[PDB]
């Protein structure tokens, strides 16, 4: 989530974060709910866009 890259053995990883749709929820700047796979565009900065892969915090 920080933006860095790491290399670790498969054993060292804790576990997959299995999250239900009731847990993986995203809200945009305006407050409209955005779900998995939707396309959003960055409001500022590079103003890039893409499809959501996973939502965390």
């Amino acid at each position: 989530s920080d933006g860095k890259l790491l290399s670790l053995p498969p054993v060292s990883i804790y576990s997959k974060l299995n999250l239900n749709p009731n847990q993986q929820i995203a809200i945009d700047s305006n407050g409209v709910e955005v779900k998995v796979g939707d396309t959003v565009r960055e409001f500022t900065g590079e103003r890039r866009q893409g499809t959501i892969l996973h939502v965390y915090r």
């Binding site: 920080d2 670790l8 053995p9 054993v11 060292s12 804790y14 900065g45």
Partner: protein, 300 residues
Amino acid sequence: ELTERGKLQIEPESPYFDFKYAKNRPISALTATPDLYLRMIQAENDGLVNIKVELPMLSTVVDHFYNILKSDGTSEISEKWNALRNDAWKQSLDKLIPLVQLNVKESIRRDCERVLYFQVKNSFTKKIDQAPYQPPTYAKGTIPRVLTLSFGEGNRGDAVLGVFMDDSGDVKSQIKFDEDFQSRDFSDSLTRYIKSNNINPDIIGISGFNIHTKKLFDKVNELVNEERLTIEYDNSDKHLIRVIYVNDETARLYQHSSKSSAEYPNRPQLAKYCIGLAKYIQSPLLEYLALDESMYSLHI
């Protein structure tokens, strides 16, 4: 200083936002906060920011060295000589400044790295410094018989697994509770397992992956308080068997390690997790040793 990449990428949520516009930060105070300087260096290496070291009294040193070097003549020839000397001195300063800046930067980097190394060493030592749980009416260092109960998640369809290990460190019996943990049947079966089979565990450990485990912990504590399940003491206020939460980084890593699979080829993953919890309670140091390489991935 900030590059265009720094001008665009340093967001209010990014960890680099703490020094987006820092200025005139004292060097002597940096050693007390090594992580700030390390993060500044990391941001610099990303092509976002530029770290600059400057002296408020640089002009004072330049003027003093010029006064030492300059001639005292007043003729126009002496004026030309002094001008040539001063210009060469300024060029020498221009050449010299970057090397001194780099040397000072490397010195501060080494100091901060050593400070953070010592800090991490102390944190790890604090993490791994804990003797095994001492049951009452026993001397310190005695290995207690332990019982671990866990169900993992608590979704509809989550049975509670129980694993008991003696002081010898060898698994004695594993049991499944297939009824609901809130039913009277669950409590009765757990009481029968605790009492009838002469298991007599010295401490009971409870752990899980979410907040659902809290209800199990409360239910177990209520059961212990209700049935007066006092510890058996080898031959009189008999003491109750303690029920606590257990830290489970080593257990989580052990449930995925192939060492457990070789040790227990016909056991479920939750059984391996409970065994890891029990071994951690028996001896945290040996469990931390069992991590081998994965210990370096722990949040220290």
